[PDB]
Structure formats: structure tokens, C-alpha cells
């Protein structure tokens, strides 16, 4: 989604469902490659080491001054008729330049966006319909014309655009954590190894303080850590090679 071959429209975004895996979010925040990285309700460095039920990456393109519309507590045509986020949206919105990426000879006028809809979209509701609606009580009955506006507007894409008119490849990471199992998490830091010394440890399954040693003790590969007769910390399996 961050290096997608083609980015879709603001109303027909490509939603990538992330589940049952790990992924670092601070690696991209401190990458110095993307322009904008703003999270609402939680810092991007805090959620890097926190699990979530599901994470959706909505890939689409909007202008520089249009990024303010895609946020909790903000209105707009793209925020009400194309992609409505909830007022309590606790996700993130990452964006970066796209002039040298999605542009072509003569300009890329393939992107589109809806100006109006019969009703406002609900939170996280996609709509790819091109139905021509009527302005007043006199409907045109189908084709465009006589106060029957076409819902989608052409998207200007030129290399000499301004900072507010520049399109940005936006990737909205909608985070959600409920009572269901937390299937999405992030990776941990590097590892160390010191033996024959009382030191603190935090393995994949448990933590504490003890002395690391080696012996000929066996261990079942389908388990993580062992316990003694009195349920005390005993020999454990290395999270690394067996």
C-alpha cells in the first residue's frame, strides 16, 4: 500500500486488511521519506509497541489542503460524500509527495472524486456508484443535463502545482482494538546473550531475573517455558533456533 503500483480514488480506495502478522510503525515515522505522519488520540511511537484487533490501510490520493478534511471532527466534500471517518477516529493518516511518481505527459486526469451525494456516508463506508442525482424536484430521469450534475469531478494533476494543490499519496491506517483477539502487533527490539551471571530477561513468553546457563535438558518444541515442582521458573526454550 505504501509502494502500490497504482493508487485509487478518494471514493474507491484500496482497503488492505492487515491481520495475523507484525509490522513496525516507528520505522516509517522516523524514515524521513514521507511528508506527513499524524496520528489522532495516540502517538505513532506509542502504538508501535501495542497490539490491535485489525488495521486497515486505505490508499487514495488527495491534495495538500484536502488532507485537513480527512480527520476526526472535520467536514468536507471528500470527508462527507467520499470517505467519512468517525469523530472518534483513533487511527493515523500518512501522506507523501506524488508529483514525480503518478504524473505523466500532459497531466494525469484519471483521478476522480465525488462532489455531492444524496445522503452523508457513515463511518468507514465506501461508495463507487456514479448515479446522476437531481438538484430539485424536477429530475432529469437518467442522462446528465438540465440541473443534473455529474457526481464525479475531474482531478487536475500538473507538475507546476502549488503546495496546497499538490496531490499526495495518502494511506490512512485505521486502528481498532476490541474484546476480540488482538491479531495485529509490532516487532520488538534486538536480542542479547550473557551467561553465568544474574541478569534480567524478557523472552517471548515470560520475563523476570535469573542466571542463564546451558545443559543437556530436553524440551518439547511445542512449548515455550518450563516450570519446576513448585511452579518456579525452570529451564525454558530459546525463542531463537532450538
Amino acid at each position, epitope marked *: 500500500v505504501f509502494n502500490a503500483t497504482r493508487f485509487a480514488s478518494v471514493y474507491a480506495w484500496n482497503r488492505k486488511r492487515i491481520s495475523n502478522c507484525v509490522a513496525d510503525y516507528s520505522v516509517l515515522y522516523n524514515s524521513a521519506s514521507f511528508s506527513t505522519f499524524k496520528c489522532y488520540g495516540v502517538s505513532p511511537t506509542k502504538l508501535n509497541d501495542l497490539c490491535f484487533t485489525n488495521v486497515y490501510a486505505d490508499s487514495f490520493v488527495i491534495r495538500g489542503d484536502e488532507v485537513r478534511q480527512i480527520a476526526p471532527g472535520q467536514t468536507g466534500k471528500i470527508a462527507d460524500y467520499n470517505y467519512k471517518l468517525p469523530d472518534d477516529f483513533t487511527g493515523c493518516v500518512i501522506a507523501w509527495n506524488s508529483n514525480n511518481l503518478d504524473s505523466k505527459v500532459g497531466g494525469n486526469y484519471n483521478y476522480l472524486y465525488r462532489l455531492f451525494r444524496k445522503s452523508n456516508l457513515k463511518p468507514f463506508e465506501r461508495d463507487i456508484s456514479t448515479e446522476i442525482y437531481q438538484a430539485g424536484s424536477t429530475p432529469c430521469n437518467g442522462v*446528465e*443535463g438540465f440541473n443534473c450534475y455529474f457526481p464525479l469531478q475531474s482531478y487536475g494533476f500538473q507538475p507546476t502545482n502549488g503546495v496546497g494543490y499538490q496531490p499526495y499519496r495518502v494511506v490512512v491506517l485505521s486502528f481498532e482494538l476490541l474484546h476480540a483477539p488482538a491479531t495485529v502487533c509490532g516487532p520488538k527490539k534486538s536480542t542479547n546473550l550473557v551467561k553465568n551471571k544474574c541478569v534480567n530477561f524478557n523472552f517471548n513468553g515470560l520475563t523476570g531475573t535469573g542466571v542463564l546457563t546451558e545443559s543437556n535438558k530436553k524440551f518439547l518444541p511445542f512449548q515455550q517455558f518450563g516450570r519446576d515442582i513448585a511452579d518456579t521458573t525452570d529451564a525454558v526454550r530459546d525463542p531463537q533456533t532450538l
Partner: antibody
Amino acid sequence: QVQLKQSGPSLVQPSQSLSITCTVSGFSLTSYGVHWVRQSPGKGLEWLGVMWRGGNTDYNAAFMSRLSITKDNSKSQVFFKMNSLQTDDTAIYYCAKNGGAHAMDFWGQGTSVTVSS
Amino acid sequence: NIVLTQSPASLAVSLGQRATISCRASESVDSYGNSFLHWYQQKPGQPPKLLIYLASNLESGVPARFSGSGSRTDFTLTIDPVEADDAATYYCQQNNEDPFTFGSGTKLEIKR
């Protein structure tokens, strides 16, 4: 890339009729309705009419009884039927690509129509 | 009969100031969620071109100096800062009611 130039007329006489064909390039004719305007007869721009997406036509209060638009979907060409042209109707006719709210995003070169024998 | 009484006929504004081109209308408003007009710009040696649609949206290729707003009857085009390459005739287009007439056209001139 986008071309909306006009051609077709040979001699436009007063109190006569003649058709103008505007080229359609850069987009499908069945997707956008070609708009029509003239080149500032006195005051600023003036509206002539607009063709639907394969339906009907709308015209201005002054040009509804004199001008008519005809959409040829078999030839992919937009025809403009003129009727009862006067000496004051001399102006350059322009075509344009339909926007969202009946806007004119793109413009062509058009053709210079002069009403005189 | 929709006659957009676009006023004034011309403007004498110096560089760096704010030019105000008004556009009055009579019919009509509440088409969908707004009632704004489309603004254009025609140079003495070039056909017209669309700058801002509905007076409140963004458009690429044109400079950022073009902005505007409008009430239910009077619509305003805002050019700020006025540079040395924006001397041309500007128009407004009716789109919320048939006929889709245009204004008389204001000649924005640089006050040298």
C-alpha cells in the same frame, strides 16, 4: 491530447442555415456533454446550449429559437444546426468538455463564423 | 431569463493588492449543497479557461492567488496577491438553473 476544434462550414449567409461539426478527442462523447458559447457579442461571453449524454438539448433564451444541437452517436461527432442567422450573429463558436456541475474544464480552438454573402 | 449582472466593468488594482470582481444572480440557489458559480479567465490573445469551479474548490495548473466566495445572490472572486501576469477578462457562469448564461465580464487591469 485534447482537441475540440470546429470545422465543416463553407459559406454562412444571412437568413440561411448551415451545420457545424466539432471534433471530439481526449474523452468519450457518450460520457460528457459538449457545451457551446460564442465570442462576446458586445458584453462578455454568452451561452448557446448544451447537449445531454445522449438525451435532449437545452438552449439560451435568445438562441433557443435560432440554434439547435444534434448529437450523432454513430459518427461520434457533435453537430450544431444554425437557423435564421443575422449580421449580428458573427462570432467565434467554441466547444468545451463538461465538468462536474456543468462546468467547462477544457476548451478548443473553434471556428470563426461570419454571417455574410 | 437569467442575466448575471457582473460588476464592475473593469478594475484598476495595483500589484500586491486584492482585486474584487463581483457577480450578481437572480435564479437560483440550493441545487445540491451550495449555489456558487464557475469562474473563468480570458486573455486578449487566448480563449477562456476554467480557474475555480463553484468558487470554493481547488484546481491544479492555475496559481494559488485565485480564490473567492459568495452569498445566495452576490458572488465574489478574490485575486490576492495581484501579480504582473493576471491582466485579463474574468467571467462567471450560471450552473444551478437554466439558462446557463454568463456575466458581462470584468476587465482586471494592473494599475501601473
